[PDB]
């Protein structure tokens, strides 16, 4: 529940919520205001359902694609960072959170899937997707499997699907045309056909999810996975000698690039406490540091601390993948996109539909 004089912060379960809590304790210290940090399930769908009338949180963390919907439904307070602060953060990162002229969230960091391989089991990770079947057969012989990654969330599958020409909305003249979806072109159909065939040929199993593939890779039962920066803390704990590298080509894999952002509920009384916490405790060198140390954030939007993080070869691997992918749109139609390509992906991997039917569907879904 929200209360005047206290901060409630939602943030997804795979990120460093504990390290953020350490930032809230420093805040509590300096001001007398208790911060509490909570990681519910499905919070990108829970927030719009309860923000207006129910118990929303004071500050909400997610990738910048969902905020265009929130700010359209007006669940979000303005943000007022002055030019002096705006300068501390990267111009492109403030662009991902700008909607209809107005900044609608605090950017935090840049996220992009990469290829994470087990150097012991695979010293030279495949540069191309098409090499993967042959590499899975030579690895099933040894008791292992080439690749396992999360096939339920279209976030992971998309890089392969946009590689040969799939896209969401046609970006033209600074404006996304919601009349022009490209999930059913030839290049998307090819991306997904390759993914389904990897499941038919037993090289991956359609049922694999985030929990299953993180366990296969962190235990050494597969040589490769696909994941973002948040995933490296648990791989470090598992002692796997891993490496983070460019994603396989198909026929480059373009991932959709997320900017982790913070927004402020319209139903908060503590809108100025939130603004002070973000600008002065979290988006500082030490604050971000405290969060990154729990679960890495990737490439933080604060210049001054991004300059040290990028010396890490992993973070340059992630920016590499980001330069080949695309920044996610933020427009409200993005929840309808993600609905449509999530349905197609799960129906084509499980056999419920053909690749051609399940993509003819998700072509209509996002722009009725």
């Amino acid at each position: 529940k929200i209360e005047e004089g206290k901060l409630v912060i939602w943030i997804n379960g795979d990120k460093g919520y504990n390290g953020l809590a350490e930032v809230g304790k420093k805040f509590e210290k300096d001001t007398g205001i208790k911060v509490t940090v909570e990681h519910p399930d499905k919070l990108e769908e829970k927030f719009p359902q309860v923000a207006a009338t129910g118990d929303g949180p004071d500050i909400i963390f997610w990738a910048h694609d969902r905020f265009g919907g929130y700010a359209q439904s007006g669940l979000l307070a303005e943000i007022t960072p002055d030019k002096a602060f705006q300068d501390k953060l990267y111009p492109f990162t403030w662009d991902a959170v700008r909607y209809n002229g107005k900044l609608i969230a605090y950017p935090i960091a840049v996220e992009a899937l990469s290829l994470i391989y087990n150097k012991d089991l695979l010293p030279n990770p495949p540069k191309t997707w098409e090499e993967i079947p042959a590499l899975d057969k030579g690895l099933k012989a040894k008791g292992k499997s080439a690749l396992m990654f999360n096939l339920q969330e279209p976030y992971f599958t998309w890089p392969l699907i946009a590689a040969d020409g799939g896209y969401a909305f046609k970006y033209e003249n600074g404006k996304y045309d919601i009349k022009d979806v490209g999930v059913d072109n030839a290049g998307a159909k090819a991306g997904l056909t390759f993914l389904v065939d990897l499941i038919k040929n037993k090289h991956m199993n359609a049922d694999t999810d985030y929990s299953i593939a993180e366990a296969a890779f962190n235990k050494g039962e597969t040589a490769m996975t696909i994941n973002g920066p948040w995933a490296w803390s648990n791989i470090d704990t598992s002692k796997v000698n891993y490496g983070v590298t460019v994603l396989p080509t198909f026929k480059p894999s373009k991932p959709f690039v997320g900017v982790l952002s913070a927004g402020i509920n319209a139903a908060s009384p503590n809108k100025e406490l939130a603004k002070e916490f973000l600008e002065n405790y979290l988006l500082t060198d030490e604050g971000l540091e405290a969060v990154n140390k729990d679960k890495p954030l990737g490439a933080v939007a604060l210049k001054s601390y991004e300059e040290e993080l990028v010396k890490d070869p992993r973070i340059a691997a992630t920016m590499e993948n980001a330069q080949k992918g695309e920044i996610m749109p933020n427009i409200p139609q993005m929840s309808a996109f993600w609905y449509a390509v999530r349905t197609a992906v799960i129906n084509a991997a499980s056999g419920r539909q053909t690749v051609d039917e399940a993509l003819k569907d998700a072509q209509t879904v996002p722009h009725m």
Binding site: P332, Q333, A336, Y339, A340, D361, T364, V365, M368
Partner: protein, 164 residues
Amino acid sequence: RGVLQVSSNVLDCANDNWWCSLLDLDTSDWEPLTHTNRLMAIYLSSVASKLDLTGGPLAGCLYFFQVECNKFEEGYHIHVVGGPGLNPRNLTVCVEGLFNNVLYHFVTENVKLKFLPGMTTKGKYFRDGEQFIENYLMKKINVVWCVTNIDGYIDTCISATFRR
């Protein structure tokens, strides 16, 4: 997306071809139906059925139908949420044709429905049907009946349990 108004008169004109169908109205996870509520179910179910094997511009389309009680007049409105060959220039005619052609068999006089397409304040057709379904129509529980061919909403649309 849009709306069709259904006056109380349209229900008065109902004939026995409309009432006498055994089609499976699955109210195990719903609320029971009143004779005119059931009339709207049967209509929605039968417009859906005819849509499924209708060609031309409506071939291959995805649809979401939802009929409610008009809160301050008698009668009902139907929420309608696209496809290739379905554009702003034929949408009204195609949606009116589909519904009038099924209803023609169910009423004892000439009755025609009108489709009012949901517009923006800036005069543009709405192209958000899916987030409309997700953020408005599925949240009603006030909802008489609902039929759809969009995967994932096929089972849930006539779940009281889910919408709650």
